[PDB]
Amino acid sequence: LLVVGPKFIRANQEYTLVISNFNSQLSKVDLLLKLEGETDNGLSVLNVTKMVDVRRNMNRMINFNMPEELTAGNYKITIDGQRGFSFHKEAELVYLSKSISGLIQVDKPVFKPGDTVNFRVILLDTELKPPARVKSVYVTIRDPQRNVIRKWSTAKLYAGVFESDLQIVPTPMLGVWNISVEVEGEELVSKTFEVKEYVLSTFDVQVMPSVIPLEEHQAVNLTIEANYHFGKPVQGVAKVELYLDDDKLNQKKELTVYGKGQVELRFDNFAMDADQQDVRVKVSFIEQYTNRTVVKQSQITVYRYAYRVELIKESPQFRPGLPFKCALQFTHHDGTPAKGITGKVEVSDVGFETTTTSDNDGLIKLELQPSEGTEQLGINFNAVDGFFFYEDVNKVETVTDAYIKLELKSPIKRNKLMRFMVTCTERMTFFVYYVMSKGNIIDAGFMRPNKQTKYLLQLNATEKMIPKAKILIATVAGRTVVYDYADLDFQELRNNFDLSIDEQEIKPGRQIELSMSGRPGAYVGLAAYDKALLLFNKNLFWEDIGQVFDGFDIFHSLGLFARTLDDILFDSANFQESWLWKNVSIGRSGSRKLIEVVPDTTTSWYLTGFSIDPVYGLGIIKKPIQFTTVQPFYIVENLPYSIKRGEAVVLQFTLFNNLGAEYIADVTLYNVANQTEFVGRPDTDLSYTKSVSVPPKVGVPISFLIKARKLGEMAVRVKASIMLGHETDALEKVIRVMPESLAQPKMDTSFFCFDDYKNQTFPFNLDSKKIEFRLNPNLLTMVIKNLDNLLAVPTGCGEQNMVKFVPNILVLDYLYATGSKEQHLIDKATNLLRQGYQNQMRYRQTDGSFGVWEKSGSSVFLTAFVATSMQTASKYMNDIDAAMVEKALDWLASKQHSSGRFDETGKVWHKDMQGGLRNGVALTSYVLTALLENDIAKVKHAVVIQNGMNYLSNQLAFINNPYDLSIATYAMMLNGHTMKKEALDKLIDMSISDNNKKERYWGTTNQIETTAYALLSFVMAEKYLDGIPVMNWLVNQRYVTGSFPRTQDTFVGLKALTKLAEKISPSRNDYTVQLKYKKNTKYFNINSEQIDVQNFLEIPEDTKKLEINVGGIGFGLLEVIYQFDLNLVNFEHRFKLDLEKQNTGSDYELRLRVCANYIPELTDSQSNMALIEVTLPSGYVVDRNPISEQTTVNPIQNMEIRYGGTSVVLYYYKMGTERNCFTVTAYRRFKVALKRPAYVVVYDYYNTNLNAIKVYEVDKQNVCEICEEEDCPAEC
Ligand SMILES: *[C@@H]1O[C@H](CO)[C@@H](O[C@@H]2O[C@H](CO)[C@@H](O)[C@H](O)[C@H]2NC(C)=O)[C@H](O)[C@H]1NC(C)=O
Ligand SMILES: *[C@@H]1O[C@H](CO)[C@@H](O)[C@H](O)[C@H]1NC(C)=O
Ligand SMILES: *[C@@H]1O[C@H](CO)[C@@H](O)[C@H](O)[C@H]1NC(C)=O
Ligand SMILES: *[C@@H]1O[C@H](CO)[C@@H](O)[C@H](O)[C@H]1NC(C)=O
Ligand SMILES: *[C@@H]1O[C@H](CO)[C@@H](O)[C@H](O)[C@H]1NC(C)=O
Ligand SMILES: *[C@@H]1O[C@H](CO)[C@@H](O)[C@H](O)[C@H]1NC(C)=O
Ligand SMILES: *[C@@H]1O[C@H](CO)[C@@H](O)[C@H](O)[C@H]1NC(C)=O
């Protein structure tokens, strides 16, 4: 017996099991079949038991109809033999839930921080068409901590394809991410992608023979190449050591390498023993200024002959008895075919001997004929010049050595006859055939040849075979089963997509014509990967879709299982990038030719492309189109990130020439907008050109000596060209020109609100500096035109990093409230809200809470804030992990005391908020505030709230601190408490009033916050008019961006301001602003209250008084922004900072010892979350981990190396009197002369006034110590 059926079952699938009786002992065979099944629960699902007789020399096809109600578990078919026949074999069956399978394509395997992950999702049914059932999917992407960063709740498919993207933020969560698609609630497919940060001063060296060495050369030529992980070439010295005879030193050369270098190593006498001898070469690369060394060793092979030979076998093994063709490929050492090598090829095992010469294509073709008994084939080649080559060819792993071959003798048209040619070793009594389509046996048959070896098998192509089917033939020779498969693909009914390149060569930077043809109106999905990108990461989506295009067990591959008798056996006969993420339609007729620009870069490409027609299904190209591009010539910069005014700077560059010859290069550094003064040249010079000879495959330096003129951003503009201008390259890089001192701009603000036509005159005493006047028709115009960066301070902590999140909610809040017709803004804010969400997930802890730090530092304050913060944002973005919020609110709820009180579990970094020294009134009121602002949260946690509101009620007459009370009041105001009015009046009673200014604030330490909470409660209690003097103060405390100086104040402040201005600003703006100063009078007009992005500058020169006349109806802010360039000088206020530059014994290394401690006062003996910034003198750069000597009194909770290693930021928890110290290690990596001094700063985060700055000087170098001979002044 031969029992064969599918190995898979489906809900409503037929199961046709085909039994063949060739056993001739009996005249019939009686069989019992049981197909049992059991769910994962343990419930019995299947007990379909059938009995049948299979007569001699025929087939019986059995159908098992499957119950619609199948669920995954444990299934198997059992063919046990009844009556007089001893037979019992069984085979386990798998459940396939879906009639569809899916594919996730991603443009890269790994991503650098600021990248955009691109993905396609492809759904295909069992016919390789787009599923007519499924219209959309459910795609979510999770970060390395499983957080739901994005989500497509209803991702509509087009031609079974969903295309989308995801931006990885500036400072993201590193590791493995997880795209996962879901259909009808069941996960269909899942792909991972990685995110790694490629920083550090770590570099790689490679050594290779520039030309494959011959014995005849008596010399080794080398290419030495050292690049940083960044992609930039390394400058340094290469120490070369060559070893000809074992570990005995033969030679030592040294060369300065600028990324790429050539070295020649000559020998005295080198006679080899064989025709190939290895040579060990050690290279030691010493990084230019640090002296950091990387050693690379390699075995460089030397050869006797100028050619090598390989054997091009038609197949890896020969079938004994059948002609085995092959050839010898003669390859020149690196390159051509060896056209004309004479020799004799000898295969003794067939008795074949030929003396010939390699042809034009460099080949000698062997068409051997091994007989029935041939073990190995000894292909031996001996040449007239003595060259020797022998490689053995072995026979196919003969499980039988008696085969059956099936050959489809004509094209497979639908309905038309299918003709096949069966060839078999034995004279056949019988053969079986089976036909699979859509995972089940469609047709079978017991064919009986008349003791023949050949049979012309003729079958009708039925409709159940459309469009992809597969036929399988089997028979018995001896007591072993032999078989063969054949593909039955109706080409006339399938997607015949093809993609091609032009008949021209591919030049990097130039454009190429892509010619593709296929089904009209079909979807096409192009992608091009860097072949080097498919390195350690893929070694790849293409194989999966290649595998999905069609279909060593040739049954389990055909989707079947096979059983036979106990004595019968089975046979077995066997810089970088990402570009061209396009998707096009075949359209018009039968081909669409898209035209594209090849990236200007030295890289090996890999170009794929699939196609999906709604009718015709999937199409694919065979091998991905593959080429490489070598950019002829390019320049590479090596520039400091920041320089100061009046320092002399060497801008280094490196030219690479990849052309055949050595050509002179011109490099021209341009003076863009008076930015750049070339040292020793007339100031009116617009450019400066130098010219250098550049050898092939060698890096050559070229530098310019400059000093910066204007502050801000210096554009470093360079054009280059070799070979008379035939090959050009240019770069547009930027060095940032910093002031000498830590500059901080002040901004005085006035606001007007006129409902009825009103004239008024606002004076502005301006009392070195530069001034700018701004009129802004909305609180948020300055804010939104700054969103992505609102604060002058770093924000690398859980609380601070919310500036990327919260301000966006509030800007979205307002725009929807007022019903803004400026969708243009809403878009920016909504986009930034999402990226803000992702950024913040980095501060999620394991227990569901949020912490001040990435790894540690869990916090109650923060958890309340972040949790409820997100709950609000939910109405503006789909992507929020709804349960993740709930689980964060639940962590919070449990942390409450029995009184209803909340304490901060973990260190104190925001004192007024996290201080328990005042009944924890602050934190309690805050947490209650957070819960109350969300309708879901208010109901779900109502019991926790009720306990808190009572704790406040019992505390109300006891609260005597303005901060605490302001929130307690806000809580009650939101709550709708009975004692709300009381609370607010007790707050009002604490207010500082200045009637000679129309200002009202709430005092001591955290004024901006307290006052904001206060105003919120006002607007709540409809005290709008009384809120106007409150606002007047707040608006005047704003930072230049439109926000407030710090994090929290911004958050509560902007909230307060928008809230009042919602209820006080007139429905229509129609007014004129007259600006009188010095001599001039400027005029501004506002007539559309609508528009937000609406800028009104004017730069007053250093004048005296300033007089503004507002006339009409509307809202407005009159801002006057003083910006300061001051002298850099030491200052201390309630912090004591000290600097000491320890000795290193190297000019090219700075180590600075820094010491900072808080100066206490009265009850205040400890600071808030304190940061230290370290600025380096121009040219210096900090390494990977530049900090050492760290004190354990107060430990650095977080480090931030920003600004291309110019600045190190150091987050502490707090500072006491106990000295907190460390030591920075920087390296002078750029030539900068006349260096102006740097500084270190310590500050309290949430208290502006408490800070300390200390200046320090490094050896300020001179112009002569730095200039190249051409640019040098006479004094050298
Ligand atoms: C290429 O794929 C994109 C999906 O990114 C398809 O663009 C969508 O087209 C439909 C109409 O067919 C629109 O309703 C969507 O708004 C489009 N989405 C986007 C993001 O623009 C497009 O169908 C595909 N094919 C071609 C030829 O452009
Ligand atoms: C299944 O049903 C058949 C016939 O109805 C019976 O003979 C057999 O015992 C049953 N098997 C199981 C495992 O329940
Ligand atoms: C190796 O390079 C050196 C220097 O460029 C040259 O003298 C020699 O001809 C080269 N050898 C070969 C085999 O190209
Ligand atoms: C298949 O083709 C036609 C269907 O109309 C039929 O007449 C013929 O008998 C069939 N059989 C074979 C063996 O081709
Ligand atoms: C170039 O820069 C400075 C800007 O402070 C200015 O004083 C100087 O006159 C400028 N020169 C020209 C030609 O604009
Ligand atoms: C406002 O000022 C203008 C011009 O100075 C003056 O004519 C007028 O009295 C004022 N107008 C109103 C409507 O108050
Ligand atoms: C590196 O070696 C050079 C050799 O001149 C020396 O000047 C310098 O002091 C060394 N730097 C360090 C960091 O050891």
Residue numbers in the entry: 22 to 560, 563 to 574, 583 to 605, 629 to 821, 830 to 1338
Paper text:
TEP1 is composed of a series of eight macroglobulin (MG) domains, the β-sheet CUB domain and α-helical thioester domain (TED).
The refined model of TEP1*S1 has three molecules, two of which (chains A, C) comprise residues 22–1338 with the exception of four gaps; residues 561–562, 575–582 in the linker (LNK) domain, 606–628 within the protease-sensitive region, and 822–829 in the CUB domain. The MG1, MG2, MG5 and MG6 domains also form a rigid body but are rotated 11° relative to TEP1*R1. Both loops are ordered in the TEP1*S1 structure. The TEP1*R1 catalytic loop contains a sequence of five residues including Lys 966 and Glu 970 (966KAGAE970).
